Automatic annotation (TrEMBL):
Its EC number is 1.10.3.2. The lineage of its organism: Eukaryota, Fungi, Dikarya, Basidiomycota, Agaricomycotina. Pfam families: Cu-oxidase, Cu-oxidase_2, Cu-oxidase_3. This is laccase. It is found in: Secreted. It catalyses: 4 hydroquinone + O2 = 4 benzosemiquinone + 2 H2O. It is an enzyme of class 1 (oxidoreductase). InterPro entries: Cu-oxidase-like_N, Cu-oxidase_2nd, Cu-oxidase_C, Cu-oxidase_fam, Cu_oxidase_CS, Cupredoxin.
């Protein structure tokens, strides 16, 4: 069952074997993925997170981010460790108490301390719309229509050796899948549909790294939502989904009663589907309980191309219709060398005092904020443009901005900008060498908002900056509860800082 919008959430260690190989993990709600947190648009969420972690190999501190929720007036509840809070220490709990005005769609939650989400603390987060403009396009939308895609590692995140390449050992679809090496015939996930019905499939990438080529043999997929933003209907037969992105698509159960492969091919790790890796099963009611016998095409006829997506609503684009046509036009220099990423020449290393606390204590220019060179001020009530030219090793990099969604004025692999009707989203691939992926948004949400690559191994290696939006208004706009004020003293005492 779904939990929320008011719930406890216990964070524990346990052994799991989602691909037949047992290892310890960091879990929310006792499971991988964690339970779905849900409510309706505008609801008050109060998620009281109980840190019960005891195994130091995966860190006993934690902090949870609610990915894609704007947190307007509640920056303290956003979750990124050392940006908006100190971590919760073991044996303690913390109420993330926030509201979701003006948002409805498919989100997720994850640890936002170090690489801890890779060790298992990840789950879906759905905000339903009782008056959804897409409601008539489908019949079923519930916990059984959520599809998570996850990378899974046999080596613990903190134990990945410095200097060796990191790749996953399995793809998990709804928490199950088979290992790339030493493959055993462990159980595959089954998604069940009834012939003649239409389903709102909520596709969530909870990946720490790979992008997936997602498809369903025999079926096509009509996109209706992108990262929380309702879209015009776009029919595709394959979706390339990057880390942390979400799509809703209508699945019409219009093929013969049977079994069909669900495919999620990562860009690294095991290639293909031998032994049932990278696979799940779409089973119609009344079908034989047996594996599919379907195949993929050699070439997909209608792959998703991001420039084909358009908002359902008339969202437009803020600013003027040319490069640099914004109040605050930025171009970030994104680089990698010698094991570390940098933005504008500075590699992100989390500060001792969280950025929000530094602001509330009176640091009021971004040159005064630590880490030096990693915090950039944005002016209030202004159009911001951020160009993110690709080329840094380890791509394609999916960049994500907290506190906001944004218009994607220029997408990967296409040099033409769109100042008329591009999709809005919150995580975007910046593409390949020579690309100039560019985003725009307006600053109506005071607080420090993280901007980073959502490949968690790259974040850890410094691929991040903080946008301190409207520093002068941050304190008045974000009143903090006593429990939040208690976090840093408790953390610093427990760690002798
Ligand atoms: C990506 O687009 C930005 C503008 O959004 C380009 O930025 C300009 O860069 C040149 C030097 O390369 C400067 O002289 C300009 O002041 C910048 N801003 C403008 C023209 O608006 C950037 O060059 C583009 N990058 C790539 C790799 O195409
Ligand atoms: C490259 O991106 C551009 C801009 O998003 C796409 O151009 C649009 O194409 C649509 C569909 O034909 C037209 O309605 C628009 O008027 C175009 N806008 C602009 C500004 O040119 C283009 O289709 C993309 N290229 C590919 C191959 O998908
Ligand atoms: Cu996220
Ligand atoms: Cu986020
Ligand atoms: Cu990256
Ligand atoms: Cu983040």
């Amino acid at each position: 069952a779904q939990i929320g919008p008011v719930t406890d959430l216990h964070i524990t260690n346990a052994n799991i074997s989602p691909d037949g190989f047992s290892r310890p993990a960091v879990l929310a709600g006792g499971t991988f993925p964690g339970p779905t947190i849900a409510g309706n648009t505008g609801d008050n969420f109060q998620i009281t997170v109980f840190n019960d972690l005891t195994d130091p190999s995966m860190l006993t501190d934690t902090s949870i981010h609610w990915h894609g929720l704007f947190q307007k007036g509640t920056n303290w509840a956003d979750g990124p460790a050392f940006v908006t809070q100190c971590p919760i220490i073991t044996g303690q709990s913390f109420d993330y108490n926030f509201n979701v005005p003006g948002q409805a769609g498919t989100f997720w939650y994850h640890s936002h301390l170090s690489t801890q989400y890779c060790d298992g603390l990840r789950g879906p987060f759905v905000v339903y719309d009782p008056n959804d403009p897409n409601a008539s396009l489908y019949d079923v939308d519930d916990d059984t229509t959520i599809i998570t895609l996850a990378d899974w590692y046999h080596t613990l995140a903190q134990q990945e050796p410095i200097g060796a390449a990191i790749t996953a050992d399995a793809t998990l679809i709804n928490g199950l899948g088979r290992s790339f090496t030493n493959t055993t015939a462990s159980p595959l996930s089954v998604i069940t549909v009834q012939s003649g019905k239409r389903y709102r499939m909520r596709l969530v990438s909870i990946s720490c790294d790979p992008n997936y080529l997602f498809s369903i043999d025999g079926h096509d997929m009509t996109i209706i939502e992108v990262d929380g933003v309702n879209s015009q209907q776009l029919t595709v037969d394959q979706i390339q989904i990057f880390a942390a992105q979400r799509y809703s698509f209508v699945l019409n159960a219009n093929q013969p009663v049977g079994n069909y492969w669900i495919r999620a091919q990562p860009n690294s790790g095991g290639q293909g589907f031998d032994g049932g890796i990278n696979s799940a099963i779409l089973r119609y009611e009344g079908a034989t309980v047996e594996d599919p016998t379907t195949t993929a095409p050699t070439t997909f006829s209608n792959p998703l191309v991001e420039t084909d997506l358009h908002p359902l609503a008339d969202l437009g684009v803020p600013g003027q219709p040319f490069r640099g046509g914004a109040d605050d036009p930025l171009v970030l220099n994104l680089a990698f060398a010698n094991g570390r990423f940098s933005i504008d020449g500075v590699s992100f290393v989390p500060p001792t005092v969280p950025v929000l606390l530094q602001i509330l204590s009176g640091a009021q220019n971004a040159q005064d904020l630590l880490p030096a060179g990693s915090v950039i001020s944005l002016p209030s009530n202004s159009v911001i443009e951020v160009a993110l030219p690709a080329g840094a090793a380890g791509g394609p990099h999916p960049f994500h901005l907290h506190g906001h969604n944004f218009a994607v004025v220029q997408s990967a692999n296409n040099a033409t900008p769109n100042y008329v009707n591009p999709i809005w989203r919150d995580t975007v691939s910046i593409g390949g060498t020579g690309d100039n992926v560019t985003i725009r948004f307006t600053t109506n949400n005071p607080g420090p908002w993280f901007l980073h690559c959502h490949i968690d191994w790259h974040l850890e290696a410094g691929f991040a900056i903080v946008f301190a939006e409207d520093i002068p208004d941050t304190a008045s706009a974000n009143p903090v509860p006593q429990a939040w004020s208690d976090l840093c003293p408790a953390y610093d005492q427990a760690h002798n800082i």
